[PDB]
Amino acid sequence: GTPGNVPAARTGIEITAAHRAFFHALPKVELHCHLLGAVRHDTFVALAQRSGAPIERAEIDAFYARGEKPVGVLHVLRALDRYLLTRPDDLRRIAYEYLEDAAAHNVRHAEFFWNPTGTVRVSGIPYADAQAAIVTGMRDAARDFGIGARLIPSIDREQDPDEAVAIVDWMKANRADEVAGIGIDYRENDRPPELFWKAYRDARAAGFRTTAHAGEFGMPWRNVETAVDLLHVDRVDHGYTIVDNPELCARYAERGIVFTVVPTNSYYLRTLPPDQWAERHPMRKMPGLGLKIHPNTDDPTLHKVNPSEAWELMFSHFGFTIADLKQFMLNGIDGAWVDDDTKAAWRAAWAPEFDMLADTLAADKLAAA
Numbered sequence: 001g002t003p004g005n006v007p008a009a010r011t012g013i014e015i016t017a018a019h020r021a022f023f024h025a026l027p028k029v030e031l032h033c034h035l036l037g038a039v040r041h042d043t044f045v046a047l048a049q050r051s052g053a054p055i056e057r058a059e060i061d062a063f064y065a066r067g068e069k070p071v072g073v074l075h076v077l078r079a080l081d082r083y084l085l086t087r088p089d090d091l092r093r094i095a096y097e098y099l100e101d102a103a104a105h106n107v108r109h110a111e112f113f114w115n116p117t118g119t120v121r122v123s124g125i126p127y128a129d130a131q132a133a134i135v136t137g138m139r140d141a142a143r144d145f146g147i148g149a150r151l152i153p154s155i156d157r158e159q160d161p162d163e164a165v166a167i168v169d170w171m172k173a174n175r176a177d178e179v180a181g182i183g184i185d186y187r188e189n190d191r192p193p194e195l196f197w198k199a200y201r202d203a204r205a206a207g208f209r210t211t212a213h214a215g216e217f218g219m220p221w222r223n224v225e226t227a228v229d230l231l232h233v234d235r236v237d238h239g240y241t242i243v244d245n246p247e248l249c250a251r252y253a254e255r256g257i258v259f260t261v262v263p264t265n266s267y268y269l270r271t272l273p274p275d276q277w278a279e280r281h282p283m284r285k286m287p288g289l290g291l292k293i294h295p296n297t298d299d300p301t302l303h304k305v306n307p308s309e310a311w312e313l314m315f316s317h318f319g320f321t322i323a324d325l326k327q328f329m330l331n332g333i334d335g336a337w338v339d340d341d342t343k344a345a346w347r348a349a350w351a352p353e354f355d356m357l358a359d360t361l362a363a364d365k366l367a368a369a
């Protein structure tokens with residue numbers, strides 16, 4: 001098969017065991033992953049059985065089925081909030097298990113999204129208890145697997161902008177080194193980023209970094225411009241439609257804005273014909289427009305893609321070379337929400353590591369031959 005059940009590669013590159021070992025060994029950061037999109041199937045089962053959720057073993061499997069013109073998985077996230085996640089400890093568990101799974105693929109630093117609005121308003125778990133539980137999961141995973149992490153409470157853009165302000169209020173009342181900034185997600189259509197100006201102002205005034213989903217679902221490149229130049233985000237999530245405006249691309253290339261990208265993005269898989277998906281995905285054109293991109297899983301267990309596979313897809317389907325992948329690694333370091341000393345250390349250490357893995361890929365290929 002193919003990672004994420006995406007269309008089969010039409011590029012002539014045959015992925016070998018050597019390639020898979022390379023993609024696996026690559027040191028990685030992950031900057032775009034939703035906690036609730038990283039729940040293991042069997043943990044989903046355990047949560048459902050304990051909560052008595054109105055979801056049977058087979059309803060759980062349409063949830064985890066990843067088809068050829070795949071539907072978006074936002075409804076699964078909604079089901080988790082409404083029926084499955086009923087105690088703070090459930091949030092601890094899924095954070096710990098996500099970080100364990102990321103670490104297994106040599107993710108050394110993961111920044112992940114969680115929507116507090118759903119947890120507080122729908123699950124009925126107080127913010128303070130929810131955040132503490134997630135932070136415990138993070139600290140346990142650092143202890144057990146050596147993976148570092150940041151939590152990014154994220155605005156549910158389908159709810160009123162007052163709920164977004166409420167998140168920043170919660171964050172200010174519960175400061176923790178693990179909690180680094182805010183994002184915004186859920187359905188972008190008709191919920192433009194400027195609607196949430198107040199929460200972004202408040203987050204930045206409180207010393208938090210910010211990011212935003214923008215230009216997904218074919219939404220206008222204007223949304224990317226608004227995120228960067230009104231909300232003043234530190235990085236952008238997706239950003240695909242920016243390719244429609246090469247002038248803006250030039251400006252943001254010069255500013256070095258990092259764009260988190262998701263090869264398994266459901267919208268493009270669903271809307272592009274399978275024979276044109278890899279060819280016409282705007283992500284393919286972004287680096288040539290001068291933009292710094294960085295590949296990620298988004299919803300790894302629901303998209304059926306792990307970090308090693310997300311990196312593989314860039315090479316197998318999207319025409320990016322080994323050298324391009326080294327740049328993407330460096331882009332992830334630049335985009336991470338850590339201090340300059342940490343970034344410098346990662347550049348100095350991971351670049352030579354990458355170089356050795358690239359030489360070993362060549363040696364492994366020769367040995368297979």
Ligand SMILES: [Zn+2]
Pocket residue numbers: 032033034185213237298
């Ligand atoms: Zn996302």
